[PDB]
Symmetry: C3
Subunit: 415 residues, 3 copies
Amino acid sequence: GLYRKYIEYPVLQKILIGLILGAIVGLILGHYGYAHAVHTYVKPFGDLFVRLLKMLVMPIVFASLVVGAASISPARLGRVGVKIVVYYLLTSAFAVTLGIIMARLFNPGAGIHLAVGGQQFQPHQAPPLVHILLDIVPTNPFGALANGQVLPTIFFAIILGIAITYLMNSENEKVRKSAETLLDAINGLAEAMYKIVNGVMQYAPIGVFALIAYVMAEQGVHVVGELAKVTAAVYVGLTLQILLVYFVLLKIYGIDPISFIKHAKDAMLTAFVTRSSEGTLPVTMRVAKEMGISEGIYSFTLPLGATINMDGTALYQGVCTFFIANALGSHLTVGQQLTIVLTAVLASIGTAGVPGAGAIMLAMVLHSVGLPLTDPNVAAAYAMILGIDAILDMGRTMVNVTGNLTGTAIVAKTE
Amino acid sequence: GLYRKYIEYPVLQKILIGLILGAIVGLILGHYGYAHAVHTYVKPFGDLFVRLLKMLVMPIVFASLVVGAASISPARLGRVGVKIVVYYLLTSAFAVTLGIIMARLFNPGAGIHLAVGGQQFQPHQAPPLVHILLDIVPTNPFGALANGQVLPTIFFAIILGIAITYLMNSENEKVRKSAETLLDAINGLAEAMYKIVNGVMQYAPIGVFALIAYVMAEQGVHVVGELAKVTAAVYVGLTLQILLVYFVLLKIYGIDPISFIKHAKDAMLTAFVTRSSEGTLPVTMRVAKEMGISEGIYSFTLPLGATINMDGTALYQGVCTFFIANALGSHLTVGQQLTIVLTAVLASIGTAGVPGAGAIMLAMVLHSVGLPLTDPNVAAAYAMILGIDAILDMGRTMVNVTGNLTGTAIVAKTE
Amino acid sequence: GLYRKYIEYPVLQKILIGLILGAIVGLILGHYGYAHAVHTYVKPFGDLFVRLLKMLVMPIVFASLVVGAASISPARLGRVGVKIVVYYLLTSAFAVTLGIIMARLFNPGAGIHLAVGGQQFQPHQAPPLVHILLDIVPTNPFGALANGQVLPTIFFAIILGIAITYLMNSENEKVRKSAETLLDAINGLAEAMYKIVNGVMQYAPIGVFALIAYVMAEQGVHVVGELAKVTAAVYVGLTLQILLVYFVLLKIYGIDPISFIKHAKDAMLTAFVTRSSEGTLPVTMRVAKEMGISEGIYSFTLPLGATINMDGTALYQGVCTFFIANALGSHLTVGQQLTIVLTAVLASIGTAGVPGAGAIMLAMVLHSVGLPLTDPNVAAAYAMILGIDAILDMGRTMVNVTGNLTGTAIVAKTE
Ligand SMILES: N[C@@H](CC(=O)O)C(=O)O
Ligand SMILES: N[C@@H](CC(=O)O)C(=O)O
Ligand SMILES: N[C@@H](CC(=O)O)C(=O)O
Ligand code: NA
Ligand code: NA
Ligand code: NA
Ligand code: NA
Ligand code: NA
Ligand code: NA
């Protein structure tokens, strides 16, 4: 039947067909002013795909991390954490530098007609760092699970797994049996979640088509002029990030880039369409599992990187800061560029793994170089950037997920 | 001792004694203007009974559905879903038609003195259907469990059970063992919940007495005149719904109606007193379990029907729409009656399984026939209806639960 | 290394060093007006310790209580509950009487210069008792777990454990196996939580230092004059409560007070610094486990007492009521003193196990003797008391936890 024929077709080809055709359809409909129709009837399928992916985030993350922490010694986990944090920081700094270079090679926003009088934006307020750090520890793990909050779930899961391992080495028979039973149940939950991810990827092509079509119909028509040059700068910078950092590092550490891409294509495409690292996390974790990476490594690195490691976001923040600076006519000094590097790395760390968060966090980077959002001209340039936010978000989320996978693979190789 | 004597007495007789005596006491106290006293000291016992029943809804539903979906093939589950949805729609349409017939045989609200100047009601706003459908898929299953949300729990539980079955057929020993352990733990939780339901049914008589007494003391004195004819129409229609639909269908499909009633009496009485299908769900599921129905069928059908299958609600909506129409003096044409049938079926589907929801959803049916709640006269008639809402809600919730059980039994017989 | 040397050092000595040095440092810094600096950089470590302790409350309570109720017959549980409630009420009444005696021996607030014009306080409103009692039964156990709510969790856990035991005695093999698996998994979770408590107690010294330093720097400088006499009355009364009630009862029932103190020192110190019985509950439960007390007793008594049994709170409420009365110049009659005893016992029962709750609940006791917070003078005295609230809260929380442990030990001995 038709359903059997659809299911039997390879998932990669279906996803690619959906992506290309959704792009074409969305562009055509947007030019012809049917973006409202696309939002009304096409978007819900993509929303369903996104919801299905998000449904699996907390269970898979919690269960897989508990099992992995149970299967890995604490010292090794600490070494892995140190290595992955170093990799995260270095890659984010390199991404911001590459974005600045791309902005300087081109000149997005130079000699741009700026129109004042649009919507205003409230100045970015620095949240207290101490509160952010303390929030890593949950006051109620059940509440953290019920309210999302991936990072506190990670903390509690690691602690629980270490405790379970310590119990499984005890002298009491009953304690050992109870710990074994709990661990087996949690592992069963994790495997069930991975199977469900397999199932959802079959519906993935329809959601991919819908999401890309909506994004095109809503924003692609706005990719013209200075905004087109911004988009080109960002996307060339993302491509260079991939080729110069991830490919080179995989070559250095002995990982075949071609096999890596073959394994990671599904996660990359899901990140591209959903624009959510957190939402794409189940697919990324399945990719790591298929790569043969130990659970104790990826179950910890990928959920953490989905929040704190965003190379594409950092590159985009740098490029957009330079664009807004040129639009205002101001020139950024070398010290200001280094301030941009530091602040964009920090903002990328603080950016949530959800659509549109990087554009919001760009305000902190802009403020760091004396470009407050309260200024009417800065507000106008920021509004211009926000118009094509989803277009850039697709690529930058894709690069974020790709970098997370590259780091996980490298760290696994080193262990 | 007294406690032992109370516990040893049959539960059915205790519940019936409580029901009759609470009805008498509440009526007498209401006539004598002691409804405040009943609300203050008698109602809390019924509130406790309701809370105890609601405590078991989410765990029993989730665990039983996971186990049942694990024990049933997906194809069979789909066939069962199709059959049960067909039965739901047909029975709801028949219920609305029967309500219209009862309204036309009598004439509730004909020549009624209508007084304007009471409370006004905001016009019913149609919620977006796409959002309602999307909400079936939870973005966080833990959040869905923690916030009620039976339908998303059903979705996630079915998916999890199917995945667990697929794991239990794998070639890996460890995966099979982990899936077995998880399934066994969930099944233990479900059986514990059923035992707790058994325990709560022992306290049920006191709560039944309290609830019926409060309802009588608060609203029975208002059942006079045109409202008495409305109540008679609704209750005769509900009785006819039972006898003409459920009894006849059980006879057709070979199920003995007498044995069915003997098994289902506890759920029917609990629904009558609590006026909550969702709250009565644990008792209904226990009834189905005692009937010998397979878990894979009832664990799916009953939680779904508790939301989307409400024959009594549909019949009540039709009768009340006709009552409000006569009160306004307007005459409903045949096409308007068919509009009423369709819209009342839709409203019954959308009505929540909680007390008083059907009266709220009646606004959509009224609007469908050009009787907006903004009109002062429509508002007056609606307020008159709301005065005896609980009296009608008892019977209509009872019929809703009875129809859910009848459909589950028929579908089980056909499989 | 330094970390190994720190970890190897005995936990008791580390905690004591931290306590003493934090007290000294906080006092010195507060005199020198650096309380802001202590709040900014020192307090976060104590906040981290408190958060880590609170992270374990719900899982440990739920799992341990389920296991204990499964391991104990319902009749024995009822007998234990009756005994512990009797002990709670008697000890709280004695504590209030002792506080009144201490207030009368000294004269806190006598001849005190009262300044009007400060912040006003809204009159205490008596919450409905029926709603409070009904809230003991949760409408959703998952929601109760996710939102804290220790008491509903206790109720559901006891019910679940009893049901599990009844299942483990069934004739069905599958039901018995499923119940066994569920119980084993829950027990594994409980043991893991206890191990995590062991781990957190290693960091406890730093948090103790930080918390005591902040409390001193913020409020100790205010302990002068009439407030110093209030503090002396409260602390002498707490010491007398310990020695006259807990020590004497332990001697009577054959429990060695010295061994009891050696086992309970960690919980006592944690309660002293955190000022939260609920937050200290994991440490208290670990203390009871190390004492050899059966899980079926302590897993029920300690979580319940952490809410409803607060001797230190009752004593503090009595002392502060007398202080406010003298400050106003009013004289309390014997009947008013007995009203104080009853109302302070009730307020201590209703006081939450969190910092500063007893001061809030003191309003009910004050109102019971015609000292409404709306009066400007009563408001001034209340504000004066609130200035040193944390100083008194430390000791009163310590005494609350000590009394809970004493009652658990006595009840265990009697069984
Ligand atoms: N949407 C991106 C973050 C961003 O907005 O830049 C992500 O989820 O990774
Ligand atoms: N209370 C009914 C719905 C209604 O209000 O009609 C039920 O729970 O089934
Ligand atoms: N903080 C105390 C209660 C109080 O405020 O008196 C406790 O947790 O026990
Ligand atoms: Na990075
Ligand atoms: Na981030
Ligand atoms: Na129906
Ligand atoms: Na409904
Ligand atoms: Na007490
Ligand atoms: Na209390």
